[PDB]
């Protein structure tokens with residue numbers, strides 16, 4: 416297919432990464448994932464704003480305007496003829512002779528983007544999934560969506576080995592987020608989720624869902640809950656651009672209530688469907 | 693020059709990294725740096741053991757024996773005719789379609805190694821350097837020498853901006869290590885340094901310096917000290933493969949004792965000089 420490589424869309428075969436690309440040596444870069452439904456990009460400007468905010472937090476200056484980036488992404492979906500699936504794209508600080516401090520010569524960032532045809536997870540949204548708790552050993556700036564993803568790679572592998580779809584992370588028993596999702600709990604019609612500070616990533620699906628909840632007039636409290644309280648909830652689900660609102664029906668052998676998708680989760684999925692192209 | 697690419701030494705321009713190399717998308721790999729003095733690799737068996745141990749802690753299986761690995765490093769130094777400088781080499785989990793969990797299939801690890809000419813930092817050892825305190829925000833598995841180095845590049849940039857050579861990190865008021873070195877304080881003829889647990893990397897120069905202290909009968913206490921205690925030390929210095937024993941004579945505008953390199957730091961540097969090729 417075709418890959419975005421800085422500001423060109425080339426055949427896949429044509430892109431080559433340097434060994435001293437700082438993204439390969441220090442994970443020094445940021446990224447995003449955008450879902451495409453029937454050829455249209457969902458919340459693409461929101462994701463581009465978060466890419467440039469992640470980049471500013473670690474002082475990378477992306478060399479293109481945000482509107483040029485949106486057009487390049489539109490081009491990439493066309494050439495690859497993507498119908499339903501996603502676009503992955505990342506930015507690294509550039510390739511420079513290995514050193515920890517920023518390149519003294521101003522080097523240009525390297526941008527890579529490509530598509531994958533991938534249907535909606537309908538069986539999971541319908542039936543729900545199993546999850547497991549994992550201690551959060553990640554760094555303290557989880558608000559940046561960076562390529563330093565080793566804490567999340569090891570947590571998701573632990574989950575996959577226990578036959579679970581996702582790992583719910585926690586710092587001394589306060590649930591923060593999932594290895595690649597935000598985590599919500601429902602108790603007595605109220606929506607709970609961890610506040611967006613440096614302990615979590617402020618997910619765009621998370622904020623779409625908090626908006627959907629204000630639209631069905633469901634109260635939202637952004638206060639953290641524990642692993643113990645998570646197990647006492649009436650309903651639980653995880654959110655991300657690729658898993659949408661995926662019900663969690665069981666954690667570590669314990670059923671969440673009766674092991675069935677709850678009523679408020681079905682109400683939030685129906686409201687989320689009105690936002691899809 | 694020539695680069696080691698998996699088990700072949702090829703010309704630098706032949707090496708191609710893939711955009712779905714897990715080292716590029718997740719920082720999912722481990723690395724080592726080995727100093728070479730006058731064509732001779734210093735403590736190369738200790739660095740290879742620490743590479744295989746870092747790879748095991750995150751379950752990457754290196755496909756070669758330590759002995760084939762040692763031969764490959766040796767060929768690399770002579771193909772490049774390196775006199776004094778260093779070898780850098782890293783291993784990643786491999787190229788696989790992007791997903792956080794390990795390849796369910798079986799993928800081979802990608803190995804990269806290359807050299808850089810670089811003389812000893814003699815002015816620093818003689819004169820000493822300035823340092824700054826920076827809070828440690830890194831993940832909790834700092835005992836693994838992994839490619840997730842973004843907390844360290846940000847600390848090192850901050851130090852460089854203040855005109856300092858190194859950032860001394862501290863977590864809960866306690867000095868842990870530098871962004872790319874270990875830290876030692878001397879008071880009343882006793883050597884102090886933080887214990888090697890998950891908060892620091894157990895540096896190979898750290899262990900060579902502790903051996904120097906044993907040989908000249910200087911007491912070593914592997915006990916944590918606070919930043920205020922650090923400022924009250926009679927002497928201070930930092931260690932790493934490329935900076936050896938660099939005296940620290942000032943931190944954030946406050947002199948360590950008289951601001952001159954101390955007596956015991958000098959007799960530790962004399963002892964280190966007898967270990968060197």
Ligand SMILES: Cc1ncc(COP(=O)(O)O)c(C=O)c1O
Pocket residue numbers: 448567592593594595596597615616617618619620621654655656657
């Ligand atoms: C660590 C982390 N938290 C939360 C999320 C959810 O973000 P989004 O809804 O923007 O995809 C993700 C993205 O997958 C993530 O990687």
Ligand SMILES: Cc1ncc(COP(=O)(O)O)c(C=O)c1O
Pocket residue numbers: 725844869870871872873874892893894895896897898931932933934
């Ligand atoms: C974080 C950190 N601590 C300590 C060290 C010093 O270790 P060594 O003596 O093995 O080079 C390093 C070396 O790169 C390092 O990156």
